């Protein structure tokens, strides 16, 4: 069967607040910017910053989550699409993802309906669902990639149609274009199936201008934003996230209780680090509290730094955050924290996978550090520190 693109969104009453989280596998993304199934979150950055990397990492992480990834490339060069599809094939994530290619060489008619086609596949997953891993799945993840080039193609089509231009030579209905494109991504209530369609649009900005027309439009229509700072990426923090201003309005409730329970004080301490960033210039003029806060913030931000193509399970996420945010890593020097985390996750995968599965099946409780899981985790971390 075929699904008609360019259709109205299901509607308001045909919706429900998102409750089921999406495990992106990135420490910063899964910690400070919770993502729930059926929400609309923006990944915005400055050209070569890592937006595509974040999207493909999220796609890779959803291998066993009953998830249907959708990656629609708009105006991308053939080389980039080939690299992306090869990367998906290498990790075996290609079996459950659909890639729609609307490349730059292709006509302006394409790159204009390609995101709409991807949304049509997403809606089909919403309503009918498909068979994946022996079970019927109705939750889909869609990444529309660079929407700025989609708007460029639509502007080209409109001007070639001699329609009156508007702000930034854009057609006046481009906001309607993107709204009808993204509004169809929803989290239906039970009586309409209960499916979900999480949308991850990508915007390319110029010189970190978040005040441009299309970026502001997509920020307005979407629920959350992930600002990717170019300076932070050049600084070595590859998952460059502007933690101070990046926010997800929805999904905080649609997060695993353990994850938020260990990430709230993480966010607080990182906020203290950002506040104390001005005071870091002074040497020996800071008391014990401020110096400890700066050290803790540097430790946590280096912890957030995660290499590409290395998804981390949610149980490992929460274990690492509990390790870092309970003063158990204050002794570790900052430059070695990444390799320490790698060694610790290897330890858990080798020494106590039972702790990992206990965390995994105890993540739904209101209190994360249940005496057994807390104790067990403390014993495991003490053993690993002894081995270190």
């Amino acid at each position: 069967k075929t699904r008609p693109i360019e259709r109205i969104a299901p509607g308001v009453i045909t919706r429900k607040s998102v409750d089921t989280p999406v495990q992106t596998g990135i420490i910063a993304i899964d910690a400070l910017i919770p993502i729930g199934r059926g929400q609309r979150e923006l990944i915005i950055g400055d050209r070569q910053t890592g937006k595509t990397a974040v999207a493909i990492d999220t796609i890779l992480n959803q291998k066993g989550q009953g998830m249907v990834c959708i990656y629609v490339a708009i105006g991308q060069r053939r080389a980039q699409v080939a690299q992306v599809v090869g990367t998906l094939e290498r990790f075996g994530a290609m079996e459950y993802t659909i890639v729609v290619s609307a490349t730059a060489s292709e006509s302006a008619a394409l790159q204009y309906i390609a995101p709409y086609a991807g949304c049509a596949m997403g809606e089909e997953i919403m309503e009918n669902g498909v068979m994946l891993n022996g079970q019927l799945v109705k939750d889909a993840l869609i990444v529309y990639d660079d929407l700025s080039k989609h708007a460029v193609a639509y502007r080209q089509v409109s001007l070639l149609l001699r329609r009156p231009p508007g702000r930034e030579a854009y057609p006046g209905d481009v906001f309607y274009l993107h709204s009808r494109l993204l509004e169809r991504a929803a989290r239906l209530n039970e009586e309409y199936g209960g499916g979900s369609l999480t949308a991850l649009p990508v915007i390319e900005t110029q010189a970190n201008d978040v005040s441009a027309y299309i970026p502001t439009n997509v920020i307005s229509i979407t629920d959350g934003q992930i600002y990717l700072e170019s300076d932070l990426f050049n600084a070595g923090q590859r998952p460059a996230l502007n933690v101070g201003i990046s926010v997800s309005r929805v999904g905080g409730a649609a997060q695993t209780r353990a994850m938020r329970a260990v990430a709230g004080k993480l966010k607080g301490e990182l906020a203290q680090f950002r506040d104390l960033a001005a005071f870091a210039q002074f040497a020996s003029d800071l008391d014990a509290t401020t110096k400890a806060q700066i050290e803790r913030g540097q430790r946590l931000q280096e912890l957030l730094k995660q290499p590409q193509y290395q998804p981390l399970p949610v149980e490992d996420q929460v274990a690492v955050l509990y390790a870092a945010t309970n003063n158990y890593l204050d002794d570790v020097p900052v430059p070695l924290i990444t390799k320490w985390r790698d060694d610790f996750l290897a330890f858990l995968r080798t020494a106590h996978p039972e702790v990992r599965k206990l965390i995994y099946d105890n993540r739904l409780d209101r209190k994360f550090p249940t005496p057994e899981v807390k104790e067990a985790l403390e014993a495991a971390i003490k053993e690993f520190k002894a081995t270190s």
Binding site: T350, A351, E383
Partner: protein, 55 residues
């Protein structure tokens, strides 16, 4: 008197250090073995997964 007990305390501490070294070396052993068994087990359970996906 202080020299005598301090020498005695040094012997107790150095004996305690050997006592402390005993279990630290010991605890490494089962952590060495228990990690090894799971690593084999993780390899094996992945091995059948590769076989069943092939079928």
């Amino acid at each position: 008197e202080q020299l005598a007990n301090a020498r005695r305390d040094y012997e107790a501490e150095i004996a305690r250090a050997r006592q402390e070294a005993a279990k630290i070396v010991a605890q490494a052993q089962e952590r060495a073995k228990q990690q090894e068994a799971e690593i084999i087990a993780q390899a094996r359970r992945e091995a059948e997964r590769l076989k069943e996906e092939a079928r």
